[PDB]
Ligand binder design. Structure first.
Ligand SMILES: Nc1ncnc2c1ncn2[C@@H]1O[C@H](COP(=O)(O)OP(=O)(O)O)[C@@H](O)[C@H]1O
Lengths: 534, 185
RNA sequence: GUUGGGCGUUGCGCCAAACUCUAAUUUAUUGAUUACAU
């Protein structure tokens, strides 16, 4: 029948195994427009194969193009695909927040067309135009299993004819693919899209938990619902409190019908044994009614055992996985339960029971962040062996908030260990977060330009990463004792090695910094060496 | 539970399903969250009370029963329920005994309906016939108002009447105006 | 990380070599080109 050569190429690609090759194969055989006669069965097969081949893929942002945005004239960046963490480092006023704000307004559009039918989203406002210019444009390429989706969002001031029209060719494709996969199979894993703005500082409060049991019931439990108010920052805790109540209620409401069923089985076993009843039934064994009743009792007991086995294999790990993944991230804390008097949660630390609303400010932001990620991954990913292994983009902005410089060396690797399939484009200003990621991933930003990190930014001396990535001196740049240190060091390595000021600065810098440190022992040893030489 | 904290504010009266669903939800969850020892007793009361109505054994009992052994057996499993309900009564507890009585109110005012559970993933407070049905969605509009009224009466009588193995056996006045309100013929 | 050579348990495995401006090719029933049937 002379199948077209392009059709044969697509069939060969599908045989090799691709998700788009079969997408454009069940839409080529389901309509007369594409040029081939519509065959329904052999299009349904391609649709099923396309949906089946989507599993195991990670959705990542590949590149980005800013033009006349907030502070960048022309920016081109490429995010690594073999690495799952990108870090933006720069001064306050260079534009690391601008790139995250540009990744959103496109992630909002992707979420809107992946969840809702609105086909709307964010856009470039008039106040975000570069001062003096007229046109702006943001382009983002989305990746999935090595196959890329284009995007571009642009605007023009309403005084000149628009020179950049919006286009969303690839994100409609991606949304349609995911929706079809959901249609054929209700439990297909979907990517997670969310950003956490600095406004998560005041996330947890008593006001939010007070009325968390007064919200709509259908707003938390469905796959397509873990997308509302998810890119607005402010990691939600009220909805998390409602969700935690419902899961703990499922545990406290079931597992008692299981106990009741076990008690019923024991009572039925006693009723069947029942020496008096057995002796009475032994009087007339050949009676048809007695045999019927005994056989029906045995069948009912077997059915009750089957009913017990039905709930014997529930294992509602929806709570256990979240609790275990959230306990590890916050050291020491364990045994998080609920207390119903002022409808508040209780968590135990160092064998001390405390409410979440009264915890340290540096431990509730992280708590809510991890809880929101875990809940959204569980909602988006249906029943599976591990529901925290999903994909998507998580944008943690200003990670250095409310963190002692002891957890900054264990925040990125712990997020990557617990969540090992999520991209984590983040921005930071603490130089104890940088020295845990490869140098090729950190993207320095200054003066509206992208600079690669120097060689060897992984585990090293914090002074060296500070000096070579922030242009900030290890010692104070303007301090009286630092100036005395310099005025001692230069005179040691020059004239006046033992003179008017050598001894007095030596004593002054020995009173402070201690008489036994690194620099001063070096200087004293070398002055002894080169006074002995003379 | 001092018999006077709910006796008041009853001269006006309220009977709606919106405030009954939230009430029954807490009553079935708070009773099961803590305690958890009365739950097994109440469930086994349900089992023993519903297993007696077995048509096969009922017909055998109604058949020739000249031997006193069957009479002794029936008296024995009646005394089983007697002592079981006596034990539940001995467990003096508000929010744990009113559930059993309010369930019995709907087990009798709606003839032939079996155990009543409360699912959570969908709320769907289900009533068990030989086929499963749902109360929050189905059961008309007035068949919820009247059930709410019956539930309120049962709860108030149970609270007003400590002990009283059959708490819904008090005595008093209950005035209803336009009893024909939201009823199918 | 990318490019050209070689062998053949060849819709590609291995071997032997190289290069780093901050930075990888996809459209037919169309038009241009190579080639067979004319
Ligand atoms: N209309 C504009 N004209 C000139 N500069 C702008 C304009 N809008 C935004 N900017 C620049 O955007 C910068 C804001 O930095 P920001 O995106 O918040 O990154 P960060 O938070 O890491 O400092 C500012 O330096 C500002 O100069």
């Amino acid at each position: 029948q002379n199948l077209p050569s392009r059709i044969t190429k697509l069939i060969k690609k599908s045989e090799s195994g691709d998700f788009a090759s079969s997408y454009q194969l069940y839409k080529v055989f389901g309509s007369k427009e594409y040029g081939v006669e519509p065959d329904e069965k052999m299009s349904d097969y391609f649709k099923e194969l396309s949906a089946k081949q989507l599993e195991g893929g990670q959705l990542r942002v590949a590149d980005i193009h800013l033009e006349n945005y907030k502070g960048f004239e022309s920016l081109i960046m490429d995010f690594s695909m073999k690495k799952n963490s990108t870090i933006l480092v720069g001064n306050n006023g260079c534009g690391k927040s601008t790139i995250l704000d540009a990744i959103q307004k496109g992630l909002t559009h992707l979420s809107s067309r992946l969840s809702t039918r609105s086909h709307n989203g964010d856009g470039i406002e008039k106040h975000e135009l570069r001062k003096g210019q007229n046109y702006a444009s943001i382009a983002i390429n989305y990746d999935y299993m090595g196959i890329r989706f284009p995007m571009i969002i642009a605007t023009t001031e309403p005084g000149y004819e628009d020179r950049a029209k919006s286009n969303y060719s690839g994100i409609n494709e991606l949304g349609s693919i995911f929706k079809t996969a959901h249609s054929i199979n209700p439990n297909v894993s979907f990517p997670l899209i969310a950003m956490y703005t600095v406004e998560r500082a005041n996330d947890v409060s008593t006001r939010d938990i007070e009325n968390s049991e007064e919200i709509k019931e259908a707003q938390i439990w469905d796959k397509f619902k873990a997308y509302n108010k998810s890119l607005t920052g402010k990691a939600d805790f009220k909805l998390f409190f409602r969700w935690f109540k419902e899961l703990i209620e499922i545990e406290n409401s079931d597992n008692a019908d299981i106990t009741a069923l076990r008690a019923e089985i024991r009572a039925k076993e006693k009723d069947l044994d029942n020496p008096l009843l057995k002796a009475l039934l032994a009087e007339n064994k050949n009676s048809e009614t007695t045999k019927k009743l005994l056989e029906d009792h045995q069948n009912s007991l077997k059915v009750l055992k089957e009913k017990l086995n039905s709930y014997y294999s529930v294992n509602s790990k929806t709570l256990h996985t979240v609790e275990d993944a959230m306990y590890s991230f916050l050291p020491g804390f364990s045994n998080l339960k609920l207390q119903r008097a002022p409808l508040d949660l209780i968590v135990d630390k160092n064998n001390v029971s405390l409410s979440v609303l009264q915890l340290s400010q540096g431990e509730k932001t992280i708590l809510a962040l991890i809880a929101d990620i875990a809940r959204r991954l569980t909602l988006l990913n249906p029943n599976s062996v591990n529901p925290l292994d999903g994909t998507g983009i998580v944008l943690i902005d200003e990670i250095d908030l409310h963190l002692h410089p002891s957890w900054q060396q264990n925040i990125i690797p712990r997020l990557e260990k617990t969540f090992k399939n999520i991209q984590f484009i983040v921005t930071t200003h603490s130089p104890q977060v940088c020295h845990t990621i490869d140098s090729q991933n950190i993207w320095l930003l200054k003066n509206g330009q992208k600079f690669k990190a120097p060689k060897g930014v992984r585990g090293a001396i914090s002074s060296w990463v500070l000096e070579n990535l922030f242009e900030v001196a290890q010692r104070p740049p303007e301090d009286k004792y630092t100036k005395l240190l310099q005025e001692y060091k230069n005179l040691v390595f020059s004239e006046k090695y033992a003179s008017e000021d050598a001894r007095k600065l030596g004593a002054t810098l020995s009173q402070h910094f201690g008489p036994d440190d690194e620099t001063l022992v070096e200087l004293k040893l070398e002055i002894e060496k080169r006074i002995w030489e003379d």
